[PDB]
Design a protein around this ligand. Sequence first.
Ligand SMILES: Nc1ncnc2c1ncn2[C@@H]1O[C@H](COP(=O)(O)O)[C@@H](O)[C@H]1O
Ligand SMILES: [Mg+2]
Lengths: 271, 246
Amino acid sequence: SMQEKIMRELHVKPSIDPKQEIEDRVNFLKQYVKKTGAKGFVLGISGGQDSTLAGRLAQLAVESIREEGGDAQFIAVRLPHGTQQDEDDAQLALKFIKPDKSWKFDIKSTVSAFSDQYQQETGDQLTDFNKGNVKARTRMIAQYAIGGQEGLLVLGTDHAAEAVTGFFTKYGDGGADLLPLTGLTKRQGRTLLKELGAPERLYLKEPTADLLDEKPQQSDETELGISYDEIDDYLEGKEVSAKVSEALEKRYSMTEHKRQVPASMFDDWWK
Amino acid sequence: SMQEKIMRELHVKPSIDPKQEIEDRVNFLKQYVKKTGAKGFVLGISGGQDSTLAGRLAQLAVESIREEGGDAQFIAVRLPHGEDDAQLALKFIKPDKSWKFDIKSTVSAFSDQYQQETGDQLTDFNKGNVKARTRMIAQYAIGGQEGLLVLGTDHAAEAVTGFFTKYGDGGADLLPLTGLTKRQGRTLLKELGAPERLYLISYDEIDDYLEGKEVSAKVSEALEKRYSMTEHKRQVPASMFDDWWK
Ligand SMILES: Nc1ncnc2c1ncn2[C@@H]1O[C@H](COP(=O)(O)O)[C@@H](O)[C@H]1O
Ligand SMILES: [Mg+2]
């Protein structure tokens, strides 16, 4: 079956123990660091549910390493494109995470430099969707530049509820070193935030990528055509309406190149 | 044997048929674009050997598809930062379209903002990586605007060492040179009739290891170390459900 198969591949647990999941995830971040010899982590904090959970997990890990006589730090970075409409959720989040360091890097001038040149080199202006993708990738560079100057690993916020729909930018938010949220559905993540004592505004707000100037704060559910509950029921093995299955299974097949390394002639996955 | 395992994983053959290799690799390219429904390819051209080989292969795949009655195009892009060999290679490849996107001002803007936000100047190594990652963005911006796939030049000799920037030049959609050693790439270039100037530890030493030739333990130990250290570059981001990083 396709439902059962996507669950295996995305590493989804139909039932989880929040306390235990948190345990395993922080422990993973710890083991990863110790094996590599890195000095810590860096993550762009947007004020959305995903980076809030992932940031708090990195902070708890870093604190645990030091408690053990270890050396490690966490830099949380606000990556606004000028003024962020939901800037206040970003601050309410910094306040819950309590990162070792809070930096800021405005990506606007880099994105402008790029589009000006684009129009100068080609004669055509970048569509809003393409500039949106230039924004996510610029955030990736910002993150990798810091990690590269300070010796830290870049954290990814990828999880199952977006892994299934391939709802991320290849080499933008999809590019990172390690992923502490892998295999968690959207309703399960909220449940870890609840355990962690997160402020409700942070998990009650609508998920959005906010990469468009033409239509900012546009929710994911507007883009996708399904709601996260339907996606979650499916990831969790619940029997769902044929209309949800057909839909998810097609979007999942057409986004496999985002969950794989560059395609070679020796790879079957694409054949 | 780590040598055999590495060879298996990097898909290297001890001996190749340059003519059959060209056909299989072009066929790979045609078939891939037909499966995805994309309109063609986009490759940043550097004058270097690897982008020259991949470019000619891209051009040949595009023409073949057009001869079968379909539609495809190849955009070769030079990406300077603010060229005689890039131009010589452009005459050998003969792409449909030759573009150019100077990365200088984007890299500069990022640099000044960085210094401005952090108080630090980006060191040489880190700024070189910003240049590789910015080239990636330019190629995907063109491909996304034109509905074209980004070709990468990663080959076996570049993969054992992990000598490339993760998401920089490593960021591509497909890789036509996979499994080829540097000297095998050279053979292909001569076969295609490329000018000597383009395909002309020890790089020939890395090839011996990859093609299964008896090498010294010195070369052997260095490479196997390098390879296990660069695994993160040939893998999708890590999670607790993976173990290659352990
Ligand atoms: N405005 C932003 N400021 C800081 N980080 C961000 C911002 N927008 C996107 N990111 C990063 O990209 C990820 C994607 O968020 P989302 O697109 O809502 O999944 C976040 O979890 C952040 O790590
Ligand atoms: Mg968001």
